Amino acid sequence: VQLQESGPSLVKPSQTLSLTCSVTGDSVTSDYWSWIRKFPGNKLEYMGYISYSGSTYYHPSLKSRISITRDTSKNQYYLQLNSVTTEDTATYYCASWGGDVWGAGTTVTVSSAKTTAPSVYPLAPVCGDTTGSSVTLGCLVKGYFPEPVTLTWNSGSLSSGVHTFPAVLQSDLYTLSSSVTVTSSTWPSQSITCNVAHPASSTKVDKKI
């Protein structure tokens, strides 16, 4: 048995979120199936399930906003959730009612933001924290959408001592930062550049610290 979700990874507030679960190695008829979503902070929610015949049960917190259907022919079942809000942003999974088999899961983001290239800012030391054996530099990636961005240092030749943090939602836009630490005597003598690629906006920027 093999499951796989599919559908848009980005939906606008008030619109309808739709997803498909393609079943393999079995028929949706010979078993019961469900939809599970994971909210940020590791919060799992059992959305509902459909029987071997087609009967359905939904989670009351989803109050008729939700709809689960199926197509024995194509051997797939579906999920529809109307008038979503940002609070519906999450990783969605389809798995056998028993939790026996699962799909890799798929992320769906609810936001009305438009594609936006990030602002990249060089984070250089305060002229007073340059007296240790090591020194850390930084890079602030601010105001982009949607995720993700790919950040490297010196086009990837610099990787040890690097901490690139998960992005967070600032003003309906994403912000992320990264630090790099090298032996103090090598900077600024041996230059360090922050490289940020944002595929969605077909952009890439390099800021030499």
Binding site: I36, Y46, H59, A167, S179
Partner: protein
């Protein structure tokens, strides 16, 4: 709805140790409890059927027990592959519900964080923004408190934090704290401070700077 309380929040162990995770139900749920494991960017994997029934393909080190309100998941000899999230699931009442989850992490020597503070860049300032960034790197445990002070007064508004996953190498954690102000507000204060408190010491690590000067 049935509230499932899993405890502890996070369990720090060393490979080989025998550990157990607790899950308390808000209502009596008989033996309608199941256990799942979820590793980084991976989907939930079933471990135990109905409180203690075994699942084919699941290593024998895993076992479950309990009924009524208290349930327990046990792992005889923890393996490096076992670190991740563990959730219990109520299928007794509707809607089905999951516990808050317990994070099984690898224990390591406590490590003090290396702290650095960075003033807004000229480019951002030109754009009317002023983000003051603070990096607290390679520390353990993850529990840490960071406070921001503007001219000696603690500032809570405008702060956004972000933590990395436990490093798959040195088992440490790192964190980023950013205080975002407008240039207007940033230029009306003098000293900015990033103060971190970690169990490794009762003395706070303090990093600061004073505007324009240095």
């Amino acid at each position: 709805d049935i509230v499932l309380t899993q405890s502890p929040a996070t369990l720090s162990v060393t490979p080989g140790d025998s550990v157990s995770l607790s899950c308390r139900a808000s209502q009596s749920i008989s033996n309608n409890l199941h256990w799942y494991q979820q590793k980084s960017h991976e989907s939930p994997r079933l471990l135990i059927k109905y409180a203690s029934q075994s699942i084919s393909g699941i290593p024998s080190r895993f076992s479950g027990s309990g009924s009524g309100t208290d349930f327990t998941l046990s792992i005889n000899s923890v393996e490096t592959e076992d670190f991740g999230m563990y959730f219990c699931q109520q299928s007794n009442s509707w809607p089905y519900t999951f516990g808050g989850g317990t994070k099984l992490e690898i224990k390591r020597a406590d490590a003090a964080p290396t702290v650095s503070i960075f003033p807004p860049s000229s480019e951002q300032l030109t754009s009317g923004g002023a983000s003051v960034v603070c990096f607290l790197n390679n520390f353990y445990p993850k529990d840490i408190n960071v406070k921001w002070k503007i001219d000696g007064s603690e500032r809570q508004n405008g702060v956004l934090n972000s933590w990395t996953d436990q490093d798959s190498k040195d088992s440490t954690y790192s964190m980023s704290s950013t205080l975002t102000l407008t240039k207007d507000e940033y230029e009306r204060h003098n000293s900015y401070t990033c103060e971190a408190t970690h169990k490794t010491s009762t003395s706070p690590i303090v990093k600061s700077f004073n505007r324009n000067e240095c």
